[PDB]
């Protein structure tokens, strides 16, 4: 198996009153951040309001992204969490604002119940002008092919002895292959032998395939019928994402409104994520400043931490977290405190337990000392190297020799900087 710095977190641990335990499901301290996250979790579970956002501010290794993954895994499978970084909004063929609205539209989940049927059977005859006489286990019916799907059928080399899985609603045709009934054609026949499908040819099912707002946007903006030749031209002339305007937005809103008022469907919100908004330019900040003043923009979370630094995209806007003053004035601050000696101890302990490292007491304490001396991450990155070193140096446990070898081998930023002021060359 594989582990990448996470999957140790398995929930906030909020009790019936929303209060999380001290160290439970991969957590250490930060009761303020945990309580604020629980409050936001309850607000999202309400599923009534929208159009509100918060930022959580904390230094490196303060559990910001850890709390984001915790809330993500707490929400559950169906409700989606949208992770995105300021580098993502810089697209290529479309403008950044449209990308932000594509993310917003695909963020909201929309449970829907549409219908699909499939014709699947052994072909009995074809009549050009079109007949495809599909013969299932108990049914043998002859559809008509429109000229385009007739051409698709022609390209499918389907002949007497073939079964095709041609969908009814989309219309595209997927041949299943040579019929297993004609297995007595060649002892080494190349084509696979598939029998006549069960049921009638026009098999009908009730499906729960849902749709995100971007999904049904691309459904009509760039139709994807697929296997038919005309569908190939449709997906080839404009295969990319086109700049959907507000007119199609209103059309889509009407369509989703009528579908959700049909009764079976429903709506569920979602959470979007942004990291290091300090690098974001003033243009996107100004645009989102007027974009959150709407009725559809779902919940997004901000993770940033900067002091008295100029906001990127400007030259004189100095503000904390690299956020313009207006956004700060319209956004909710969550505080995070630096980790402590005992927090470092428990962090290294849990990170050893998840990594299947039975680190003993004194080794754990010394690793905590290094964590408290230079940085938490410097100590955390050494758990696997020290274990592997002790494995190569024939030690199940981690003696002080292993950690000293790691500290003289894998240096930190401070020691490298100490080296850097005494060098004949860079």
């Amino acid at each position: 198996t594989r582990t990448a710095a996470h999957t140790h977190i398995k929930g906030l641990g909020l009790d019936e009153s929303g209060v999380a335990k001290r160290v439970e499901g991969g957590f250490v301290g930060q009761i303020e951040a945990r309580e604020a996250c629980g409050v936001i979790v309850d607000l999202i579970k309400a599923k009534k309001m929208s159009g509100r956002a918060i930022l959580l501010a904390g230094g490196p290794s303060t559990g910001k992204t850890a709390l984001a993954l915790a809330i993500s895994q707490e929400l559950g499978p169906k409700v989606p969490f949208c992770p995105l970084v300021g580098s993502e909004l810089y697209s290529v063929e479309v403008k950044k604002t449209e990308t932000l609205m594509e993310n917003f539209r695909r963020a909201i989940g929309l449970r829907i119940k549409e219908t699909k049927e499939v014709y699947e059977g052994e072909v009995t005859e074809l009549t050009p002008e079109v007949i495809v006489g599909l013969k299932s286990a108990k049914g043998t019916k002859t559809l008509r092919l429109d000229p385009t799907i007739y051409e698709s059928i022609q390209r499918e080399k389907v002949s007497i002895g073939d079964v095709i899985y041609i969908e009814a609603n989309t219309g595209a045709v997927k041949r299943v292959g040579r019929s297993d009934a004609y297995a007595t054609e060649f002892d080494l026949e190349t084509e696979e032998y598939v029998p006549l499908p069960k049921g009638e040819v026009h098999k009908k099912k009730e499906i729960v395939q849902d749709v995100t707002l971007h999904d049904l946007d691309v459904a009509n903006a760039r139709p994807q019928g697929g296997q038919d030749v005309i569908s190939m031209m449709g997906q080839l002339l404009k295969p990319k994402k086109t700049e959907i305007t507000e007119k199609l937005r209103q059309e889509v809103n009407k369509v989703v409104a009528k579908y959700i008022d049909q009764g079976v469907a429903e709506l569920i919100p979602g959470v979007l994520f942004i990291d290091e908004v300090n690098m974001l330019d003033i243009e996107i900040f100004t645009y989102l400043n007027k974009a959150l003043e709407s009725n559809i923009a779902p919940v997004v979370v901000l993770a940033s931490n900067r002091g008295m630094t100029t906001v990127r995209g400007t030259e004189d806007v100095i503000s904390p977290h690299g956020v313009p003053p207006d956004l700060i004035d319209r956004l909710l601050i969550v505080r995070t405190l630096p980790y402590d000696k005992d927090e470092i101890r428990t962090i290294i302990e849990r990170r050893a337990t998840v990594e299947r490292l039975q680190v003993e007491s004194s080794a754990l304490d010394l690793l905590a000392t290094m964590g408290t001396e230079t940085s938490l991450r410097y100590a955390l990155q050494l758990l696997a190297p020290c274990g592997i070193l002790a494995q190569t140096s024939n030690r199940k446990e981690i003696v002080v020799n292993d950690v000293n070898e790691a500290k003289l081998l894998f240096l930190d930023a401070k020691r490298s900087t100490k080296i850097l002021e005494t060098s004949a060359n860079y």
Binding site: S17, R52, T242, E243, D261, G307, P320, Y339, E373
Partner: protein, 446 residues
């Protein structure tokens, strides 16, 4: 319809004003700002007049002064039949339309035309659809018995409409809103006769809409379209694809000139109806000098819809130039346009607005929590308490009691910080987070 659960801007429905163009202190949600609401009524009467063009007004002053509330109230108060363009100026940049093309598209969208077309109909229960062969003497003996509730009548198909009924596979008895210059017969479903059919038990499975109007009557159907649809039709033979997908492609000028002439003569011929709407733009201090010259010439042009342009910042840097002037705009356009200043609020109107928000959210508040919210809002800003009320309501559920008490607002205040709280917290942590140089002293000890 129009799925939008709630918003901080979904609390105003239609504004409030009087025939005297005088403000209402509680004008359907938005309150105060007598000058702002009187000017809104003045502009409303201006646009109802439809006799002036090329006017630019600047909603100046400090931010948070109900500017967006004013725009929303105007939009909801003017009424239907007049589509607007309420888009912030930040997204003018695009990878498919240039700045000139985008500005031209906005200007041509702000001015609309309604079109009345004298289309026809053939309504009535078409109980049967007979399609006879193409006999030489009569090229189509196609019987089809369209009859409304008023009369019983038969008709005949001219070898062109047989597939018009069944472009999509439908049966007879369908109310057909047929158009002579369309070729696409629209079936409305099922329909009724006035007969009891046979003697034995029957007449089952018949409950639908029956034709009501006359067998034939002229319909002067009115359609409203913008210059975008007409221009994209001119540029390409097919225009619906670019209207939906959004890949028009920077249509050329002689198209706009010929559309200008065509619309002028259509208005002169009494077939079209001009609807000169008004454009709304935001963040004008952020606008750039080429846009400044564009609007400067547009104002002097004979055709220019009125402008709702506003700069939240005051005495800010003028984007696109090396100099800063008041409102972030140079004195040329500043003198060319007109100015309406907007000042901030006191506490009581914040209290009233928050009470309106609460009763819109149908939450049984307790006035102690409301007083706490008023104090928190007046200390910092309205939006602070506007979010605090919702989070305190969430805390009210979290403690299993419907009423919003003091402890809810207190927990909301202590959990989520304040701008002053955040700046104090960061200026005491000048060496704990990422800074200008990025120096983060993660080393708690030694």
């Amino acid at each position: 319809k129009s799925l939008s659960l709630i918003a901080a801007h979904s609390h105003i429905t239609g504004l409030g004003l009087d025939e005297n163009l005088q403000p209402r202190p509680t004008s359907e949600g938005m309150v105060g700002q007598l000058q702002a609401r009187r000017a809104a009524g003045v502009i409303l009467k201006m646009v109802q007049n439809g006799t002036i063009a090329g006017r630019a007004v600047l909603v100046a002053g400090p931010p948070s002064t109900g500017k967006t509330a004013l725009a929303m109230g105007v939009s909801q108060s003017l009424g239907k039949d007049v589509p607007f363009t309420a888009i912030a100026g930040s997204e003018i940049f695009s990878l498919e339309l240039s700045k000139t093309e985008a500005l031209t598209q906005a200007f041509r969208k702000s001015i609309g035309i309604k079109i009345k077309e004298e289309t026809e109909l053939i309504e009535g229960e078409v109980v049967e659809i007979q399609i006879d062969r193409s006999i030489t003497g009569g090229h189509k003996q196609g019987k089809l018995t369209i009859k409304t509730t008023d009369m019983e009548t038969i008709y005949e198909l001219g070898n062109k409409m047989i597939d018009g009924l069944t472009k999509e596979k439908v049966l007879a008895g369908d109310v057909i809103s047929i158009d002579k210059a369309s070729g696409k017969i629209t079936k409305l479903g099922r329909s009724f006769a006035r007969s009891r059919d046979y003697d034995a038990m029957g007449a089952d499975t018949r409950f639908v809409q029956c034709p009501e109007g006359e067998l034939q009557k002229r319909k002067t159907v009115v359609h409203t379209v913008s210059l975008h649809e007409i221009d994209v039709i001119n540029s390409r033979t097919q225009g619906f694809l670019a209207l939906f997908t959004g890949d028009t492609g920077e249509i050329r000028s002689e198209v706009r000139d010929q559309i200008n002439t065509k619309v002028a003569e259509w208005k002169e011929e009494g077939k079209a109806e001009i609807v000169p709407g008004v454009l709304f733009i935001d963040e004008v201090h952020m606008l750039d000098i080429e846009c400044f010259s564009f609007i400067n010439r547009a104002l002097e042009d004979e055709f220019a819809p009125i402008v709702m342009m506003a700069t939240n910042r005051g005495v800010s840097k003028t984007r696109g130039t090396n100099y800063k002037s008041p409102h972030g705009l140079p004195l040329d356009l500043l003198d060319r346009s007109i100015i309406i200043t907007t000042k901030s609020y006191n506490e009581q109107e914040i209290k009233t607005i928050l009470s309106i928000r609460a009763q819109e959210e149908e939450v049984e508040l307790s006035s102690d929590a409301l007083d706490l919210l008023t104090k928190t809002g007046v200390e910092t800003s309205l939006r602070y308490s506007s979010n605090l009320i919702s989070v305190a309501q969430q805390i009210a559920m979290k403690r299993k009691n419907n009423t919003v008490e003091v402890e809810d607002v207190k927990r909301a205040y202590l959990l989520f910080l304040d701008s002053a709280r955040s700046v104090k917290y960061v200026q005491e942590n000048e060496s704990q987070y990422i800074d200008d140089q990025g120096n983060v002293q993660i080393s708690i000890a030694k």
